[PDB]
Ligand binder design. Sequence first.
Ligand SMILES: *[C@@H]1O[C@H](CO)[C@@H](O[C@@H]2O[C@H](CO)[C@@H](O[C@@H]3O[C@H](CO[C@H]4O[C@H](CO[C@H]5O[C@H](CO)[C@@H](O)[C@H](O)[C@@H]5O[C@H]5O[C@H](CO)[C@@H](O)[C@H](O)[C@@H]5O)[C@@H](O)[C@H](O[C@H]5O[C@H](CO)[C@@H](O)[C@H](O)[C@@H]5O)[C@@H]4O)[C@@H](O)[C@H](O[C@H]4O[C@H](CO)[C@@H](O)[C@H](O)[C@@H]4O[C@H]4O[C@H](CO)[C@@H](O)[C@H](O)[C@@H]4O[C@H]4O[C@H](CO)[C@@H](O)[C@H](O)[C@@H]4O)[C@@H]3O)[C@H](O)[C@H]2NC(C)=O)[C@H](O)[C@H]1NC(C)=O
Ligand SMILES: *[C@@H]1O[C@H](CO)[C@@H](O[C@@H]2O[C@H](CO)[C@@H](O[C@@H]3O[C@H](CO)[C@@H](O)[C@H](O)[C@@H]3O)[C@H](O)[C@H]2NC(C)=O)[C@H](O)[C@H]1NC(C)=O
Ligand SMILES: *[C@H]1O[C@H](CO)[C@@H](O[C@@H]2O[C@H](CO)[C@@H](O[C@@H]3O[C@H](CO)[C@@H](O)[C@H](O)[C@@H]3O)[C@H](O)[C@H]2NC(C)=O)[C@H](O)[C@H]1NC(C)=O
Ligand SMILES: *[C@H]1O[C@H](CO)[C@@H](O[C@@H]2O[C@H](CO)[C@@H](O[C@@H]3O[C@H](CO)[C@@H](O)[C@H](O)[C@@H]3O)[C@H](O)[C@H]2NC(C)=O)[C@H](O)[C@H]1NC(C)=O
Ligand SMILES: *[C@@H]1O[C@H](CO)[C@@H](O[C@@H]2O[C@H](CO)[C@@H](O)[C@H](O)[C@H]2NC(C)=O)[C@H](O)[C@H]1NC(C)=O
Ligand SMILES: CN1C(=O)CN=C(c2ccccc2)c2cc(Cl)ccc21
Ligand SMILES: CN1C(=O)CN=C(c2ccccc2)c2cc(Cl)ccc21
Ligand SMILES: *[C@@H]1O[C@H](CO)[C@@H](O)[C@H](O)[C@H]1NC(C)=O
Ligand SMILES: *[C@@H]1O[C@H](CO)[C@@H](O)[C@H](O)[C@H]1NC(C)=O
Lengths: 106, 208, 254, 255, 255, 333
Amino acid sequence: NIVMTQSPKSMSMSVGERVTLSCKASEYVGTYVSWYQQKPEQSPKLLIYGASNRYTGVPDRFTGSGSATDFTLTIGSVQAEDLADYHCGQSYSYPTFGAGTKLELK
Amino acid sequence: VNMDYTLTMYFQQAWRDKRLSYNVIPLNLTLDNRVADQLWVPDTYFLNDKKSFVHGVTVKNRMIRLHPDGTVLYGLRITTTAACMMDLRRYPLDEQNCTLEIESYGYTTDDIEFYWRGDDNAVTGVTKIELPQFSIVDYKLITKKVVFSTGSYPRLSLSFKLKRNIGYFILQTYMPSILITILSWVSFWINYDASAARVALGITTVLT
Amino acid sequence: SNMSLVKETVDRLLKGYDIRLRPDFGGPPVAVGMNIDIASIDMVSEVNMDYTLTMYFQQAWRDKRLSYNVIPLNLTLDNRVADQLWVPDTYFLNDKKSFVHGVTVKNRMIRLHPDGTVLYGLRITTTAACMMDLRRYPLDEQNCTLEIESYGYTTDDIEFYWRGDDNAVTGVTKIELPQFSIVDYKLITKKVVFSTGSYPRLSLSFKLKRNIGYFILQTYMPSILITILSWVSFWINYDASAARVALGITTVLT
Amino acid sequence: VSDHDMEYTIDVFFRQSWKDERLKFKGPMTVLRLNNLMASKIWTPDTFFHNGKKSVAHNMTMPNKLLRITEDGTLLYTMRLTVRAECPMHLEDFPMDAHACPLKFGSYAYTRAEVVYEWTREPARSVVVAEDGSRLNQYDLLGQTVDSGIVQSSTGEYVVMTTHFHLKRKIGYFVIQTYLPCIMTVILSQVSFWLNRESVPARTVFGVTTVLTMTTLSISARNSLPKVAYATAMDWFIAVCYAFVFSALIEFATV
Amino acid sequence: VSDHDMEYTIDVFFRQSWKDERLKFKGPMTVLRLNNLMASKIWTPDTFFHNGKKSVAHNMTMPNKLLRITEDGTLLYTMRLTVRAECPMHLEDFPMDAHACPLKFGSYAYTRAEVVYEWTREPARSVVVAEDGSRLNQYDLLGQTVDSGIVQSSTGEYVVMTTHFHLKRKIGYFVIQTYLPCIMTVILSQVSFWLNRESVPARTVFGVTTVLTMTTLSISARNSLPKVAYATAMDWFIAVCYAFVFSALIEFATV
Amino acid sequence: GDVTVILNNLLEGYDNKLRPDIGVKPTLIHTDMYVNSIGPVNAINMEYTIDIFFAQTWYDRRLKFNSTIKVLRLNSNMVGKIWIPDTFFRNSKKADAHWITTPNRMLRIWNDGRVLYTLRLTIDAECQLQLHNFPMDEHSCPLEFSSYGYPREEIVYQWKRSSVEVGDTRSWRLYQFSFVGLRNTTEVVKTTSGDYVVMSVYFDLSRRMGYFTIQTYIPCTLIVVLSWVSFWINKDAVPARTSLGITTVLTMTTLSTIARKSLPKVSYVTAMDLFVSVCFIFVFSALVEYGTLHYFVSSQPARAAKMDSYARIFFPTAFCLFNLVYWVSYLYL
Ligand SMILES: *[C@@H]1O[C@H](CO)[C@@H](O[C@@H]2O[C@H](CO)[C@@H](O[C@@H]3O[C@H](CO[C@H]4O[C@H](CO[C@H]5O[C@H](CO)[C@@H](O)[C@H](O)[C@@H]5O[C@H]5O[C@H](CO)[C@@H](O)[C@H](O)[C@@H]5O)[C@@H](O)[C@H](O[C@H]5O[C@H](CO)[C@@H](O)[C@H](O)[C@@H]5O)[C@@H]4O)[C@@H](O)[C@H](O[C@H]4O[C@H](CO)[C@@H](O)[C@H](O)[C@@H]4O[C@H]4O[C@H](CO)[C@@H](O)[C@H](O)[C@@H]4O[C@H]4O[C@H](CO)[C@@H](O)[C@H](O)[C@@H]4O)[C@@H]3O)[C@H](O)[C@H]2NC(C)=O)[C@H](O)[C@H]1NC(C)=O
Ligand SMILES: *[C@@H]1O[C@H](CO)[C@@H](O[C@@H]2O[C@H](CO)[C@@H](O[C@@H]3O[C@H](CO)[C@@H](O)[C@H](O)[C@@H]3O)[C@H](O)[C@H]2NC(C)=O)[C@H](O)[C@H]1NC(C)=O
Ligand SMILES: *[C@H]1O[C@H](CO)[C@@H](O[C@@H]2O[C@H](CO)[C@@H](O[C@@H]3O[C@H](CO)[C@@H](O)[C@H](O)[C@@H]3O)[C@H](O)[C@H]2NC(C)=O)[C@H](O)[C@H]1NC(C)=O
Ligand SMILES: *[C@H]1O[C@H](CO)[C@@H](O[C@@H]2O[C@H](CO)[C@@H](O[C@@H]3O[C@H](CO)[C@@H](O)[C@H](O)[C@@H]3O)[C@H](O)[C@H]2NC(C)=O)[C@H](O)[C@H]1NC(C)=O
Ligand SMILES: *[C@@H]1O[C@H](CO)[C@@H](O[C@@H]2O[C@H](CO)[C@@H](O)[C@H](O)[C@H]2NC(C)=O)[C@H](O)[C@H]1NC(C)=O
Ligand SMILES: CN1C(=O)CN=C(c2ccccc2)c2cc(Cl)ccc21
Ligand SMILES: CN1C(=O)CN=C(c2ccccc2)c2cc(Cl)ccc21
Ligand SMILES: *[C@@H]1O[C@H](CO)[C@@H](O)[C@H](O)[C@H]1NC(C)=O
Ligand SMILES: *[C@@H]1O[C@H](CO)[C@@H](O)[C@H](O)[C@H]1NC(C)=O
């Protein structure tokens, strides 16, 4: 059972600043890590399918970086619509997700 | 060294095709071997082979033969190099089982059924095989069904147990080593004052 | 246009063409002229008693059915038309494994001339067989030959000759063998007789002379040196027996 | 003739003649010397070699096949092909042995009641070997021997045409390779009997180096022939020579 | 695994599946398990192996292919073939090295915007190696590892599916071949230090004999591994053992 | 669909036996290569393996269609239905395409009639290696190609500006050699059938002396020092020095013979034969020097006393001077 550890557990950030999210796997997951975004009282939406591939309908400010175990999701010019939770999940085996990181504004 | 055995065989298959049924003429029909490219023949294959071919001299060595009730007989002359992994922990005093696996590729067990025609006398010519190194002690025929992710397939298995001869290995390796080991005992019969003689003898035996 | 004219010419030439019959099937024999452009001689093996050579093998004859007069140029066609034309059944009698190269397509050439002359070239790698007389090895010379014969057609159906008769075989002065050196080569025309008839035969024979430079520095110099190192024991006195015996026996072992 | 595979190679013009009443014609020619592509549109017999291993029918530059049809319906069909056949050998008298390597052919799928074979000339004059056609390095072809018989298999009764080529091995290679080094090593072991007993290392290194040379000769000599389980005549010679060398060393030990 | 050629062999059932809406039907059967000659009349993907050298697709007795068409239009297409793929090895820790031999396949002629590949099951469960499926004598298969990526060529981007097989070399052969004889030869050199100082030829032939066998050991041990231009672990072991034997002989010379 | 009607309209009245512009002008073919790997360069058969992606491009005015799609991207199914040039490699001993799992070929036809045809090839090309200075040698041996049947007046080849591209250069099968660069060439050669435009790609290779070093240069020098150690042994122990010298001679012979099996059966002296020859000579001279020493201690002792002390300094200096002159003379070339 591949466990994904996501960091940090909670973060705060203002508008128009670079932000970096990390996901670390216990075992090998090749490039089958996906990043989902979930706003409150909504269903999760796939942002990055595979390591470093944007889904259809995602802005060009989200970009992923992959490896065998270490994965990153970076947002560039952050607007006021990136106030959501972000989950990383692996698909090399039976899928397991991360804990999530709630971005807040301060 | 390659972990394989080459065998030549006359491999014949017999089934019944109700479309190839005639009753105007009363005799059996041996047709030219090129009409087998216009009939249905089963897609039999050997799972453990490495290289195989049908002999093609002076023509393609295959046989087609029809019967008035519908039965088709289809023979080939096949030389195949099948892969048997050997356990050489007792070499050369060993006995190895080398098996030709015979399976159907496309048709599952709900489309085709395999059986040995006779179930013990289906394979002939084993007792007349002479090998320079081995000796066929026993052979067995086995019917089976294997299961893959695509379905269940019929399988036949022809396994031969081969026992290795020892006389060559005796005269090649066992007798020279024993003779050098007796020869290396003459160092004690030489007196212990002469040093160069005993060193030359012992060292020569070790090098040999 | 010109493409339409050539298209109708090729379509007229190939319509009603019988590949079973040679040119002049009831009349005089057809004359086929040979050129060989030797690309390399690969490996002259003494243990297998054969040699390997790559060649550009060209045959020229005249077929009146493939004659045209509406266009003034020579027609180089795609090599797939060689399966729709008659080509002679030339074979090599002393070959062991031959093939036509096949990258990127089948390496052959088919060219039609307006007077009916067909030019047909192949690129072959032949492993021809020759028995060598190694009684004077390595100070020996070997005549190794490629025999060229017609299989089906007898001498009253086909006729062979060399195109030029002295310059029909080129590229022999550029062959670089690592162990031999070509001193001379000959072209021979004759007829052989089998129980089925008389057949024309051409013969391209090469004389290969073996060098000595490797054999000297590998066998002749060491053996002489070891004999001198066996002679050195005469300068050792007869008292020291162990030294002289060890020296002699180890020169024998070397 | 490969001795380690127990096989041999042969290159033949293989001719077959038969009569087809459906191919009668009447024209300005009495024999049609046709191509090798008309033979694939008519019935030709399916001859195979019973003891062939990997044969090749040459097709350079065209398929080396010949078809001649005579106006009364007689066909001559000739092929040029290289056959690699099995020759089961008994190497008790190696390397002074004589073999009869066989070459058996017949029809695949056509029994005796359908297709029968025959020699076209007298059986002693049918299989003809050329004079310059001999790629034998190690053997000597003495003669040929044909035969005819009837084999019986699981598909019916078949006609089998047998040919035997009688070979006699040449000893001149194995002499210099094995028999003369063994005699040289035995005489070199027997040289030691003329040295004086006050030189113990001399006779010791004599004995041990000739035993080493005999061991090297035995291992290097047994790789020529296949891995048979019985003793040959070279094995007996090597064994007696090894016994003589070892006996010379044991006599030195006793002295 | 052929270390001398930097390659390995693998026998696979290679299965592909896609959806073709032009092959929909409605009949009594829900799946047509057709022949291997129907797959030539329809479109099939042109998968090739990016690191395959000379692969074979078996044709005995019939073409070992499988085509199944389901009523809704999905096609399953299976082949049986022997891949001979390239495995680049870094033999610096030989013979105590581990490797990850790749097997990359993708589409020829169809870019990423035309044909994409994917595993039919979970990526950890898609490449399945059989239990009795191991012809390895020198290595040990530890597991598999798949991945998927994109290659950027001169004609577009192409999907590439990667599979790594992890191997671990077994030391049991090289121990008995080289590392135990080197140790025994070094011990044989060191036993010369116990002979008396009055036996000068004895210790001389000890030292020089050990040097000769170390030389023959190093030549016999280098010919297994391919001709790389660097030093492995076995080379360092043989170098230090040769240094020990040579140092023993120079010590005898000084004594 | 629409691609089916376009493909069916392109192949009506089409003759794949005739090149485009059969009586107008020669056909211009643009060629590209991508070397995936340069395989093992074995000198025994004077050859080397190479794996390439060969791409050709030309213009065919018969494959010109009007449609809303710009390019037809096809498999190898239609390669045998249009005209394909008869490119062949002139210096290849054996060459094959790839057929697993489907013929590795690609055809792309454009809106104006431009055809691009790519296929994967593995060539076993031929190049005569002048194996002097071995193993400190450098080679540059080619891969040439041209049309087989079409002369200069019918087919003209031409490189692009980004013609030949190598890959990673680290996953290549070059054990004993090292890739240094490449250069392209175009020429016209006279042949019995006509004048042909031939294009060459020369790969420059340099042999890295890392295997032959630890195989022959270190052990032969070690055996020479082994023969040297006989001088410090006492001059009275005659069997010791004789056995040492002659067994050292044995080791030199065996090492020389096992070392010459790498390179082909060339008849000239290389830079490796000279080294092992001089090492054998050195061992020969050491043994013959001890022989003359043992004769001279019995004939006259005044000359044989200081001969060994002279040898102890003359042999290493002569060998070191030989090594210096040899290495500079063969690394300057
Ligand atoms: C002396 O005798 C020798 C023995 O007979 C003889 O050798 C033979 O030479 C001929 C001619 O050179 C060879 O024929 C061609 O082979 C081409 C492919 O070749 C290579 O592959 C074969 C095996 O053939 C199989 O595999 C390919 C690729 O998968 C298949 O496409 C083939 O159909 C065939 O498949 C069967 O077998 C497979 C298992 O092997 C099965 O998996 C499969 O399902 C099939 O059952 C190898 O044997 C070759 O090895 C040899 O040659 C190389 C040369 O360098 C050597 O190095 C090597 O060592 C071997 O010697 C080689 O690997 C075929 O593509 C080709 O078919 C085409 O062209 C002709 C002429 O135009 C057409 O009539 C024919 O229909 C084929 O055309 C179509 O397909 C092509 C594909 O590229 C399309 O481009 C084209 O448009 C056309 O499409 C049409 O038909 C399609 C259906 O077929 C349809 O879908 C399309 O829509 C369209 O309508 C031809 O068969 C023959 O293989 C050699 N055999 C052997 C054993 O060597 C030698 O030449 C003789 N010498 C002399 C001097 O006489
Ligand atoms: C692999 O096995 C298959 C089937 O066993 C082989 O296919 C057979 O190939 C031959 C050669 O093309 C076919 O013969 C031909 O028939 C056509 C008519 O369709 C005719 O025009 C040709 O002149 C030729 O006579 C034969 O029908 C075909 N058999 C089947 C069942 O499709 C294939 O050649 C094998 N490949 C190798 C490399 O061994
Ligand atoms: C050589 O090795 C093969 C491979 O294991 C041996 O084959 C095995 O043979 C036995 C006896 O025939 C089979 O056991 C039988 O199982 C059936 C189950 O249906 C049972 O009804 C019988 O009572 C019997 O126990 C076994 O299936 C078979 N193994 C395989 C995988 O085929 C073979 O016996 C060995 N020896 C020789 C001389 O070939
Ligand atoms: C290497 O050996 C071959 C075969 O032995 C030599 O071929 C022979 O060439 C000679 C003269 O070139 C031919 O002899 C001549 O016969 C004609 C009529 O038959 C006669 O008018 C002449 O007086 C002369 O005797 C002979 O036909 C030919 N032998 C065969 C069977 O081809 C060849 O010359 C040798 N040398 C080289 C380097 O080619
Ligand atoms: C490959 O060939 C091309 C042309 O044959 C070479 O191209 C030229 O490069 C020089 C500068 O290096 C330019 O001035 C020329 O104009 C280029 N030619 C063309 C036609 O544009 C190219 O350098 C060659 N590549 C090599 C030798 O590696
Ligand atoms: C980057 N690259 C090229 O540009 C040449 N063509 C490509 C390719 C060509 C056709 C289909 C898929 C991929 C290729 C294939 C390999 Cl195995 C390695 C490098 C490479
Ligand atoms: C067979 N042999 C030896 O015995 C050692 N000395 C010789 C030699 C020694 C002196 C002069 C010429 C040749 C030599 C040289 C080579 Cl390059 C390979 C094997 C070999
Ligand atoms: C046909 O074969 C069967 C068995 O193979 C045999 O019983 C029968 O007699 C044969 N028919 C004729 C007419 O001989
Ligand atoms: C055709 O080839 C012949 C033979 O060399 C030559 O004389 C003639 O000029 C060629 N025709 C053309 C148009 O080039």
